[PDB]
């Protein structure tokens, strides 16, 4: 049998690499799946991490935290996977000094200490993941004027 | 320009007739039963988003005269994202599945066109949220080389 | 039915976008199908002109005409063709300078009458297309850590 | 650097790994069956070169111990080109079956690895020549703007 | 020569960034073709209280896929003129200032180029080296 | 510091047009890291005859997907030493000269680069533009 460890790492490869999930919240923004760049910790497992403003339109809909399925591609479209979770704020010094980096530190004024600064968790529970592969027809010939 | 509704309406059409997948869920549920799908449309622009499918597919049972829903969508390169908003609903027309068939829909149909276990699904499209993947300059670092 | 106009049509666009073709001759350079950028007139129908040096190792052995078979693939893989005809060489003026752009005149030093300047023709009868799409595999639910 | 045979070498299994199509003709024949199919390899570089195919593929009849074979291979983007040349023969081993085993191949094969109309073919390469695709700067030409 | 020159200008306004002397900046150009190349910027960048009236400059572009280098020559000065500002404006602009268009740290610089070399840069097969496989 | 120098010299080594003043040219480095940078050319360029002893020379490179962009700033000089041309001999140098490394039209300069400044370009998600569809 095929063992789900290497699904599950090919999913985490390829989010560390291509970031972008499409957060989609039922009941805010129409449900609109807006891209946000997630960042991991290491190289596998959760929670995802998504830096944003503290005057972003979610932020006020949050709460203790609102359920969300995320629409993640690989670059390339090699793989699809639906990630649902909880979306929340948490806005931790420590997470913000562990994740912060150049890429980051471009997104805002004042550096970690920016009033602005706001960091939104997903802890997805699941996921599901659909390979991509190509597929070859049947050859036909043809004469070529 | 590049930010009028036009010029994004195109890119949209262009990438979605190329790259074909929208990952859709129903609006408004616990279960949305998302699930990644290839559209397709008759000429390069403007809709209604065909999607072929099977007849057993969890979606189908639930749209009756159509349900909402969103469509997440990305180009290949990841170049630009989009969220379609619209109306989803089964609409099997033998003439619209004469147009839009072609040899890869032919490859997941053992039946063919006659086969019992085909659907064919239409979005009529409202609206989408489009978000283009650009690029941000960092400052710039002096380093001594050698 | 789907007429083979449609096929040949994918074919001819592909190759005069993306160019190479990996020509393979039987009994010269043990075989082996080098790729070299095709050019056509017009956008579609053949002969499949390409560039070349007097002082190239394959001159010498097409004499009339050597039986070819070509391999292309579009860039980005959505189609494999299996080209087949005949290869000879052809450095025909007029064809030169139908041809001619900023392009190919970088490859000569003295321009349309360099010397050292060879063209080869491929007279294709027929080809081989397959197209490769995409095919999404079964979801895989997987629980995230 | 680039040009050298390690690179090269690199290179190519990396583009061969990630891309797989192999256009494959029987070298020295009037019809070399030319087609396209899907390179495997264990691990991330070396031989040899296996390929799932059918037992009524055109070439399996004609290879017997093994026939020389041209294998015109091109990476995805067409950065690099490679001609791969070598012997073909069947090596329907179930072993290399079983770690060759992989969801992909699992859907071209109803039988699964106990359908009879299953074969494995080996390529056991010899050699390859390599062609990376540059690019040449053309001489500059001054306009005047506006 | 007139085909040369709007493939530059198509890849200009697709991919923007140019090399001004020394760093890089985003243009933007009304419009497909023809300059004045537009830079949004801040009133605290160096260049500005270097312009004055408007110096000479050189820039270095590329396309994306490297397929077109260009070396573009102009006259460079800062015209923070609001008709202009709300002509270029867009949410992608916007973006980049917390106060709007009346952000005080606003600053938008033309260049108006005179002259320009282009230099394509096509694809092309190396030489074939042979290799022995493990 | 140390890992965005690396960055750029990898770059440097598979993207090697460099934007020197003012045209592009194709750097060629000895290892993964640092310089000299070299640059294959003809007897006949324009350089030549105005670098004498070495001049000072500009480069502007970036990378091929535009995610590093670099200011070079360096000596420039003729250094056609048939050491070095051994050395950095392929067949791909080899097909730029029809006289091979004793043609007398091939010329090679070296880039002694003290300082350089690099620009990382990060992608950045764009502001959402809602647009009706039809």
Same mark, same amino acid.
């Given at each position: 049998?095929?063992?789900? *460890? ?12 291509? +970031?972008?999930?499409? &957060? ?5 923004? !129409?449900?609109?799946?807006? /891209?946000?760049? @997630? ?7 959760? /929670? ?21 399925? =995320?629409?993640?591609?690989?670059? =390339? ?10 979306? +929340?704020?948490?806005?931790? /010094? ?18 970690? !200490?920016?009033?602005?600064?706001? $960091? %939104?968790? %997903?802890?997805?529970?699941? @996921? ?12 036909? *010939?043809? $004469? &070529?004027?």
């Amino acid at each position: 049998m095929a063992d789900p *460890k290497e699904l599950q790492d090919k999913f985490w490869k390829a989010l560390k690499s291509d +970031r972008t999930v499409m &957060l989609g919240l039922d009941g805010v923004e !129409d449900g609109h799946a807006r /891209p946000m760049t @997630a960042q991991i910790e290491g190289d596998s497992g959760g /929670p995802i991490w998504f830096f944003t403003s503290k005057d972003n339109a979610l932020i006020a809909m949050l709460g203790q935290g609102r359920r969300v399925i =995320g629409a993640f591609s690989s670059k =390339g479209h090699d793989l699809f996977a639906s990630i649902s979770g909880s979306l +929340r704020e948490d806005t931790d /010094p420590a997470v913000v000094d562990r994740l912060w980096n150049p890429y980051v530190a471009a997104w805002y004024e004042g550096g970690k !200490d920016d009033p602005k600064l706001a $960091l %939104l968790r %997903l802890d997805a529970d699941h @996921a599901q993941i659909w390979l991509n592969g190509s597929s070859l027809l049947a050859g036909i *010939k043809v $004469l &070529l004027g």
